Amino acid sequence: MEIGVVGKPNVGKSTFFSAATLANVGVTYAITDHPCKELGCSPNPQNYEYRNGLALIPVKMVDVAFLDDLRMASALIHVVDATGKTDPEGQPTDYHDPVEDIEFLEREIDYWIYGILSKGWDKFAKRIKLQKIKLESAIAEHLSGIGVNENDVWEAMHKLNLPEDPTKWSQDDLLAFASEIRRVNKPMVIAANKADAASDEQIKRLVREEEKRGYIVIPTSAAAELTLRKAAKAGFIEYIPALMVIKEKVLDRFGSTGVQEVINRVVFDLLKLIPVYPVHDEQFGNVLPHVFLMKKGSTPRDLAFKVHTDLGKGFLYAINARTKRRVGEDYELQFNDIVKIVSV
């Protein structure tokens, strides 16, 4: 899993990456309540990090800007100019609705996917109508390079009443199918950056307009968190809650720099990942050693495979290290679950 950061120049896109990442790849973090707010205490973390009762789980991040750095992205954070004082090409102007740069990015990803399907698409439909290939699998392989599942393909098709016989697919079907793939394969969160220099009216307007279109929009001040981040000597940040007291003030207005919020919304909401911790006793003797981002709907056996092939293969059953009782095989991992895996 990895998050790509995209945007036009001069809206703080690079700053957002720099800020959240402190060659073009880095590691940011997913902060939520670490299980150790109940009975749990002094954890010995290995794949993550403990911090004031909060779990900081690492996540790959890419400075996308050559725009095939997004190809494998599970999600994108699209940084835009909330003040709307930037041109499409990214240069000073009186007013340019960010909502239009959002759509710009949108169509480029849509047609990119569409061209891969469309180009050739005749000498694909017939290599499969007689060879009888599985349409889902064939498209899936063909777009395997972007991160598409045979399940994603199955659903998209199912959702748009498309036929198993590709030769019956029209161009309209292709573009529509492409868009549906983007929505699921390249979901994004919009960072309305430079919010501090914008009015509540400007921000609220873009949030409203775009949240109706299926986009999550959060105000943000990248330059700010980079500062208090790039405070690793002169003072204590986390980050959420000397003349930089202005950021304390002019960013007392949002409750934070917004950067951290965007990353949590991508991980926990967009992708719907939930933290889960596998134990040996509800191996080498450390407590709550690892944490895994599981997709909601996962089961303990799925948690077994994240650890190792055999654990998953020799799976017998699991125990909820909280309830202390044996779970079902169809049990759905819930946010922040502690689990014991039993394998032959």
Verbal overview:
With 344 residues, the protein is α/β, with parallel strands linked by helices. It folds into 3 domains: 2-96 and 187-272, P-loop containing nucleotide triphosphate hydrolases (Rossmann fold), CATH 3.40.50.300; 97-186, Helicase, Ruva Protein, domain 3 (Orthogonal Bundle), CATH 1.10.8; 273-344, Ubiquitin-like (UB roll). The protein contains 12 helices and 11 strands. It has helices spanning 13-21, 99-118, 122-125, 135-142, 150-159, 171-185, 200-212, 222-229, 245-250, 259-270, 300-307, 309-313; strands spanning 2-7, 25-33, 50-51, 54-63, 75-81, 188-193, 216-220, 273-279, 292-295, 315-320, 337-343. The strands form 2 sheets. Strands 1, 2, 3, 4, 5, 6 and 7 form a 7-stranded mixed sheet that branches. Strands 9-8-11-10 form a 4-stranded mixed sheet. The longest helix is centred in the first third of the chain and has 20 residues, at 99-118. Pfam families: MMR_HSR1, TGS, YGR210-like_G4. Belongs to the RelA/SpoT family.
List the helices and strands and how they pair.
Elements: E1 2-7, H1 13-21, E2 25-33, E3 50-51, E4 54-63, E5 75-81, H2 99-118, H3 122-125, H4 135-142, H5 150-159, H6 171-185, E6 188-193, H7 200-212, E7 216-220, H8 222-229, H9 245-250, H10 259-270, E8 273-279, E9 292-295, H11 300-307, H12 309-313, E10 315-320, E11 337-343
Parallel strand pairs: 1-4, 1-5, 5-6, 6-7, 8-11
Antiparallel strand pairs: 2-4, 3-4, 8-9, 10-11
InterPro entries: Beta-grasp_dom_sf, G_OBG, GTP-bd, P-loop_NTPase, TGS, TGS-like, YGR210-like_G4
GO molecular function: ATP hydrolysis activity; GTP binding
Family: Belongs to the RelA/SpoT family.
